[PDB]
Symmetry: C3
Subunit: 148 residues, 3 copies
């Protein structure tokens, strides 16, 4: 199997795929909030589900959208950085720690966001998860630059 291409790759693929699934969960939650609170973004949706007055914004829907957007701002770069980083021959344990800190930090971020936890819990989880990303980005820069 081509998952064996590098020692850190299986760990990366596990964490990344779990995070993609976590984003899918956020999308499902968003839909449920829209349906249960009757807050739709489109008139065609609202008309099917009770009338035009239900094409409206809702604070909980907006919160779900913010969590999903923050995921797109952070998890998508990780998908790129972590994949490339897996092929740079990092220490296996060190690589696992990068991926695990990101995974735990991002899951905690979504819990803090959707659960409306007190500040600065969410902000802290964002920063903690960004640390391994910054680390990987720098390592990739050095490897790329030295092969120019």
């Amino acid at each position: 199997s081509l998952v064996m291409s590098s020692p850190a790759l299986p760990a990366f693929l596990l964490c990344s795929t779990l995070l993609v699934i976590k984003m899918y969960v956020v999308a499902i939650i968003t839909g449920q909030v829209r349906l249960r609170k009757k807050a739709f973004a489109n008139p065609e949706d609202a008309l099917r589900h009770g009338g035009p007055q239900y094409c409206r914004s809702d604070p909980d829907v907006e919160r779900c959208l913010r969590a999903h957007r923050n995921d797109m701002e952070t998890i998508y770069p990780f998908l790129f950085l972590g994949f490339v980083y897996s092929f740079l021959g990092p220490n296996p344990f060190v690589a696992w720690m990068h991926f695990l800190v990101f995974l735990v930090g991002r899951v905690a971020h979504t819990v803090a966001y959707l659960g409306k936890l007190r500040a600065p819990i969410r902000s802290v989880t964002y920063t903690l998860a960004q640390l391994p990303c910054a680390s990987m980005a720098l390592q990739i820069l050095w490897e790329a630059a030295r092969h120019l």
Copy 2:
């Protein structure tokens, strides 16, 4: 050519690249709607195109932005999942069906969204396209986990 690395890869690259181009088309449409309806997001844009009153929201522009955002929420994960999945030695026909269902579902989604088709047509296309993504995600999880 390195497109021959795995039997499913060419099909994946065809569908993915078509979907990226489809997102570029949505961006172009959005710009055209802004210009034709004179609804700009920035005062500097509005001042060049008729005056400050044209820095304003428009329902059609907002709809275009929602379609593009939904694309980012779904197509970007597919770019990751489908690429990895291509290297897990899936049955070629089964892989093609995953990619084709996603491609058709997503093109239909954009048509349903921008064309303002009645509910739940758009919602159905979203769910149909998510099915192969969920399938690939699970398969990657198993492959990654078993190589830990």
Copy 3:
């Protein structure tokens, strides 16, 4: 090192990683604008930083969010397209020019957006950066199609 897999790859990884870092910079700027202008998206954030009246929108924050969103609409597809393109054996110089035009165009875009430069400077930088992306997308299409 696996950065040597193709002659264009190191250049791609350098430009892509710089652009990811540039997006991280936009996120940091956004946070600074929120804190300094006291414009938070969440009541929990506002309550920690002065009171509920600071859960409010701000034009500079919204501008930062637009720049970041435009980055997600353009840089993320480049991460995919440029990676695949690196493995299609393009002329090394031609590949470098694709990556450099994208890098310069996107950095200029962020400067034009956040710096509130007169129209159509930002629009021009967007279009200039999209050119190499369109070029790579077409080249990938041909390579993928011919291997079907």
